Amino acid sequence: GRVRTKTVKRASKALIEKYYPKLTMDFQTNKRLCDEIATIQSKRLRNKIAGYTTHLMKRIQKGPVRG
Amino acid sequence: PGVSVRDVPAQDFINNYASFLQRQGKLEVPGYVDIVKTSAGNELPPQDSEGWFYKRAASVARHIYLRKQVGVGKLNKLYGGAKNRGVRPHKHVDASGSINRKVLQSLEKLGVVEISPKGGRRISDNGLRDLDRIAAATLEDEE
């Protein structure tokens, strides 16, 4: 039952919309990017945010997506 | 080559050392044997009515050899299991103290156990030599 509630999805959406040139396909690089360019309080939320950011990046690479 | 008691299976070592101590006339048994439960937890005396004290002495001597040094009350904790407390849950009941004290003094007389400075009793050089000797006896007895 992993659904990635509001916060992670909205944060990843804003991350992509403001930092697409810097984001990559790899989870670890985007994790370091999330650490540096955004102040996520905890680290589990940081990891969820980076994971969904990578997923959205992969979807974008496949093609153009809504939202 | 060389052999220690750690190199021989336990139960065989206690059995053979008890047999050897029973064969020789040393290690006097207290006159109160045959009458004692050996523990409050137990409800009958040992099935082997005569000679069980020799087995207890053998086990005690092996235990002192293996460990650092052991007193009497610690042996009380070691022996003795669960008492059938009638219709109440079983607990742990320490074994009889007089029996283990007599074992320790008898082993002192045979010279196999020495009083340790840190309290309790440790093994002595002569008794430890006897212990490894009987361990070898058992080991080459096996094959």
Binding site: - | R6, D7, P9, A10
Partner: protein, 141 residues
């Protein structure tokens, strides 16, 4: 100095620390040779790495294991893991890569726990239940 390493293997609350050295094929647990592991019916469990690998693989290797904590069979599984991991770590450190991977293939194809510590451990108890997940009886009337 003598080529020597130290590894460990754990069970629920058991812990076996094994020192491996370049010896003469000498395997002792708690100062006693491996053939006298107490439960005597899980004895084959502790020979398992020996027979899976083959004794000739470590004939000039000596083994010293101190196992503490946990009950009997937990200790036995701890010694199993300690011996296996010690063999693998020694082969990695001083022997060769291929030998180590061959040992890992022989091991992990049989009782994966032999190199990987078990993750299952007891569940904390809770009030209103005499067990960790059980519950008291209900009256209802």
């Amino acid at each position: 100095t003598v080529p020597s390493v130290q590894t460990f293997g754990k069970k629920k609350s058991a812990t076996a620390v094994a020192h491996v050295k370049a010896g003469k094929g000498l395997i002792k647990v708690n100062g006693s040779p491996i053939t006298l592991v107490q439960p005597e019916i899980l004895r084959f469990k502790v020979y398992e790495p020996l027979l899976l690998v083959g004794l000739d693989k470590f004939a000039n290797i000596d083994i010293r294991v101190k196992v503490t904590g946990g009950g009997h069979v937990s200790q036995v599984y701890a010694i199993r893991q300690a011996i296996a991991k010690g063999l693998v770590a020694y082969h990695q450190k001083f022997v060769d890569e291929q030998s180590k991977n061959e040992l890992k293939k022989a091991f992990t194809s049989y009782d994966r726990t032999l190199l990987i510590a078990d993750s299952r451990r007891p569940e904390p108890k809770k009030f209103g239940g005499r067990g960790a997940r059980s519950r008291f009886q209900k009256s209802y009337r």
